[PDB]
Amino acid sequence: TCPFYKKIPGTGFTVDAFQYGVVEGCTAYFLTHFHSDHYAGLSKHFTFPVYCSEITGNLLKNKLHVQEQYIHPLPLDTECIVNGVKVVLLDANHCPGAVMILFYLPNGTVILHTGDFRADPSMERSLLADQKVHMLYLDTTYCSPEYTFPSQQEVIRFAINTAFEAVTLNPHALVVCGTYSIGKEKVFLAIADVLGSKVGMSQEKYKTLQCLNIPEINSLITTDMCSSLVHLLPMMQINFKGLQSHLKKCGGKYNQILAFRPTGWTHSNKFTRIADVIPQTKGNISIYGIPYSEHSSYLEMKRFVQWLKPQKIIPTVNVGTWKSRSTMEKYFREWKLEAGY
Ligand SMILES: O=C(COc1ccccc1)NC1CCCCC1
Ligand code: NI
């Protein structure tokens, strides 16, 4: 059964609703981004129209094998008519291909669905600038003031400086970066760039990255592991056992591993600043957890919502408990009273 917060009223549209079978009355299925919780249920035998970004469409075709006849890519920042309704796709500042969707309902109501997003002041100068939004379907992943983390730029500066120092001290060190989905590619691309190397990876991960429209990608990545001193591995292998195993396979080329585990928020963000971050170490292996977020911090979310001044907010994350629903509703009311809308 498809839940209410994935339906768009007054239309035949759903958003990120592929795991409920045939949804009654749905004429077009929107997909905000290529993350498995959101695409859950999509496969090669899907036979209804799917509306999405170009990048998401490339991933649907090549990774899930959805037939081309059902993939409807739309350009960003452009008014489009879908089944008699005006829509706009906006960059979500999440992973590659991720969008927010503006719906202009036939009755005059305007709805914004953020999908997953990392709110930014630049969104205040998007096509949102003009206009009234009556309903906001909001990515509330980190909707509590405890959720603090640095800018993406600060985290990348830390990673580049850490990697460059380690490899300049020991030219026989290998750098390894964990991954389990699209997103956060800047981590491994920025480290490889400072080290003068391509990024080495499996055939499967190479295929995925080839779908993302990254400029000059062929100059940046490779399946030839021997040519590369920055390697990508599944996130599940970023531990002392897994990294020891990997080092054995490298034919005596390296005598040290420096590894990065991009995470979201963790409770060490309540205590330790990015500059003060230290690794876990066992012998010649060191592992850094770095808080590289592709979701809004509490402060970023609050700024966006107080600027947009929506008439009603519908959370799309942390909706499953009464305690988390009540917590979110209290913050929305504070924000409204503070700003006066
Ligand atoms: O209980 C939770 C579960 O996730 C929530 C996320 C947003 C709003 C409400 C809940 N988190 C807590 C972590 C430690 C301190 C802050 C809330
Ligand atoms: Ni996501």
Swiss-Prot record:
Induction description: During mitosis. The mRNA encoding this protein contains an internal ribosome entry site (IRES) in its 5'-UTR. This 5'-UTR generally suppresses translation while specifically promoting expression during mitosis, when cap-dependent translation may be impaired.
User: Which subcellular locations apply to this protein?
Assistant: Nucleus
Report where it is expressed, by tissue. Expressed in brain, heart, kidney, liver, pancreas, placenta and skeletal muscle.
Question: What role does it play?
Answer: May be required for DNA interstrand cross-link repair. Also required for checkpoint mediated cell cycle arrest in early prophase in response to mitotic spindle poisons. Possesses beta-lactamase activity, catalyzing the hydrolysis of penicillin G and nitrocefin. Exhibits no activity towards other beta-lactam antibiotic classes including cephalosporins (cefotaxime) and carbapenems (imipenem).
The record describes its quaternary structure and partners as: Binds constitutively to TP53BP1. Binds CDC27, which is itself a component of the anaphase promoting complex (APC). Binds PIAS1.
Belongs to which family?
A: Belongs to the DNA repair metallo-beta-lactamase (DRMBL) family.
Query: Which protein, by its recorded name, is this?
Result: DNA cross-link repair 1A protein
**Organism in which the protein naturally occurs:** Homo sapiens
Q: Point out the gene that encodes the protein.
A: DCLRE1A
